[PDB]
Amino acid sequence: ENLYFQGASDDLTIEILTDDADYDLQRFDCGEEALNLFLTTHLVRQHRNKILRAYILCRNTPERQVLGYYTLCGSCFERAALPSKSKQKKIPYKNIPSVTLGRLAIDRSLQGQGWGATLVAHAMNVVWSASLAVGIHGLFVEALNEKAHTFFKSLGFIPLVGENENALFFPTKSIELLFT
Amino acid sequence: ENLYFQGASDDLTIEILTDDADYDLQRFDCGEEALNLFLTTHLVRQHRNKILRAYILCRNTPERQVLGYYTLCGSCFERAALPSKSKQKKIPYKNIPSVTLGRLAIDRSLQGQGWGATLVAHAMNVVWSASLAVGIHGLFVEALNEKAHTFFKSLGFIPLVGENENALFFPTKSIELLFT
Ligand SMILES: CC(=O)SCCNC(=O)CCNC(=O)[C@H](O)C(C)(C)COP(=O)(O)OP(=O)(O)OC[C@H]1O[C@@H](n2cnc3c(N)ncnc32)[C@H](O)[C@@H]1OP(=O)(O)O
Ligand SMILES: CC(=O)SCCNC(=O)CCNC(=O)[C@H](O)C(C)(C)COP(=O)(O)OP(=O)(O)OC[C@H]1O[C@@H](n2cnc3c(N)ncnc32)[C@H](O)[C@@H]1OP(=O)(O)O
Ligand SMILES: [Cl-]
Ligand SMILES: [Cl-]
Ligand SMILES: [Cl-]
Ligand SMILES: [Cl-]
Ligand SMILES: [Mg+2]
Ligand SMILES: [Mg+2]
Structure with missing residues (x-):
């Protein structure tokens, strides 16, 4: 149909964290305090020391x-052939190389306007290019909040069944089909 | 010094496996039969289905x-703070996101002429660009042969200490310093 995806503008850009910053981190406020302290206290130093990619x-x-x-940070999860509530019970499993979407926060002023989805689309595309180079099978995310969990589900992230019941996954095969 | 690295020529190129192939796989012969059967029987189909990147x-x-x-294929390993010969004995460990160099074979006619090292350098550079995008901490390799093991060691791959005694690792921090 006359169906389009709209990304970041020149007014509001998505870019990897720079070497020299000059970002105003002091005004940022999403709902959660945890994601606020992380931004001003840990984000820049964890990116510099390559603990994550911001x-x-x-x-x-x-x-x-x-x-x-x-x-984003390279991760891995064990993928069982069937739902295995008791770890390693003779049920087949491969180790799935993935990329973890560790954090995702949007300022309250911008929330519910498609920016969370646009950032997810950005991450999916970064993961997609990297998959073609080194072999990554998808985007992993552990959703704390119920509001955060429904958000990922909406975008087509498969809720994984396991001991932890808050993980979701978006396969690379699915990203391929998004960007054709 | 007047110290240089010499890569692939236009006579002998290194490139990711193409969609349409037209490669002469029937003449290839390194020392090991296993790596020979893999090339003609599994390589092209495993690359197509994105099981690995050839x-x-x-x-x-x-x-x-x-x-x-x-x-190349995304992988992970558990990194213990001290050598832990008995798995999970209250000794600290992080999960290290890495890329596994699954296979590496050079035709007998070309062996011992710097092509193995040049391919390793190529892989390191592919891993390096991907690290900066998604957060990968190095290049992992499980060396079967003793001749293969000494080869990786020579190039500066750290032999890892564990239950399996044939694994080696080349950190991204070290790749950074190679390409400056
Ligand atoms: C850190 C983690 O890994 S978990 C993340 C948890 N973080 C937080 O909760 C912090 C506070 N919250 C936020 O930062 C944001 O609200 C987020 C990250 C949860 C979501 O970002 P937002 O930009 O607010 O959401 P966005 O506007 O993209 O989507 C709103 C909803 O409309 C829907 N929607 C989005 N885009 C469209 C569109 N183009 N057309 C129709 N529907 C759409 C989506 O389904 C989405 O989820 P919902 O349907 O369950 O409501
Ligand atoms: C699949 C796996 O993960 S394990 C790989 C096992 N595969 C096999 O054994 C298959 C058969 N063997 C081969 O394919 C090849 O012999 C390989 C892959 C083992 C090595 O590739 P080659 O091109 O033969 O080795 P290359 O010529 O790069 O290096 C030769 C040696 O000279 C040294 N060398 C390489 N380049 C230089 C240089 N520019 N200056 C000085 N010394 C050098 C290296 O240290 C290397 O190892 P060594 O010192 O232990 O001998
Ligand atoms: Cl399997
Ligand atoms: Cl879930
Ligand atoms: Cl730590
Ligand atoms: Cl070893
Ligand atoms: Mg929004
Ligand atoms: Mg050689």
Whole structure:
């Protein structure tokens, strides 16, 4: 149909965290305090020391106000052939190489306007290019909140069945089909 | 010093496996039969179905003779703070997101001429670009042969201490310093 995907503008850009920053992290506020302290206290130093890869959503003005962010880090999970509630009970399992979407926060002022989805689309595309280079099978996410959990589910993230009941996965095969 | 690294020529190129192939896999012969059967029987179909990422060393002639190859696949290993010969004995450990160099074979005619190292350098560079995108901490390799084991060690791959005594690792921090 006359069906389009709309990404980041030049007014509000998504870019990987820079070497020299000049970002206004002091004004950012999403719902959760945890994701707020992380941004101002840990994000820049964890990115520098390559503990994670930080991508920022910012105003592209001289002040450079941060209005959202996300993090990516190589991960792995065991994929059982059937739901195995008791770990390693002769049920087949492969180790699935994935990328974990560790954090995802959007400023309250921007929430519910499609920016969370646009950042997810950005992450999916970063994972997709990397998959074709080194072999990554998807985007993993452990959703704390119920509001966060329904958000990932909506976008087509498969809720995984396991001992922990908050994990979701978006396969690379599915990302392939998004970008054709 | 007047110290240089010399890579693939236009006569002998390293490239990711193509969609349409036209490679002469029938003439390839390294020392090991296993790595020979893999190339002609499994390589092309495992790459297509994205089970791994295959990179080929070929003659760049019309016949397109394959004279070496390698495979990359996202992996993970548990990194203990101290050598832990008995798994999970209250000794600290992080899960290390890595890329596994699954296979590496060079045709007998080309062996001992720097092509194994050049392919390793290629893989390190592919892993390096991917690290900066998604967060990968190094290149993992499980060396079967003693000749294969000494080869990886020579290039600066840290032999890992564990239950399995044939694994080696080349950190991303070290790759950073190679390409500056
Ligand atoms: C850190 C983790 O891994 S878990 C993340 C938890 N983080 C938080 O909860 C922090 C506070 N919350 C936030 O930061 C944000 O609200 C997020 C990250 C949860 C979501 O980002 P937002 O931009 O607010 O959501 P977005 O506007 O993209 O989507 C709103 C909803 O409309 C729907 N929607 C989105 N885009 C469209 C569209 N183009 N057309 C129709 N429907 C749409 C989606 O389904 C989405 O989820 P819902 O249907 O369950 O409501
Ligand atoms: C599949 C796995 O993960 S394990 C791989 C096992 N595969 C096999 O054994 C298959 C058969 N063997 C082969 O395919 C090849 O012999 C390989 C893959 C083992 C090595 O590739 P080659 O191109 O033959 O080795 P290369 O010529 O790069 O290096 C030769 C040696 O000279 C040294 N060397 C390499 N380049 C240089 C250089 N520029 N200057 C000085 N010394 C060098 C290296 O240390 C290397 O190892 P060694 O020192 O232990 O001998
Ligand atoms: Cl399987
Ligand atoms: Cl779930
Ligand atoms: Cl730690
Ligand atoms: Cl070892
Ligand atoms: Mg929004
Ligand atoms: Mg050689």
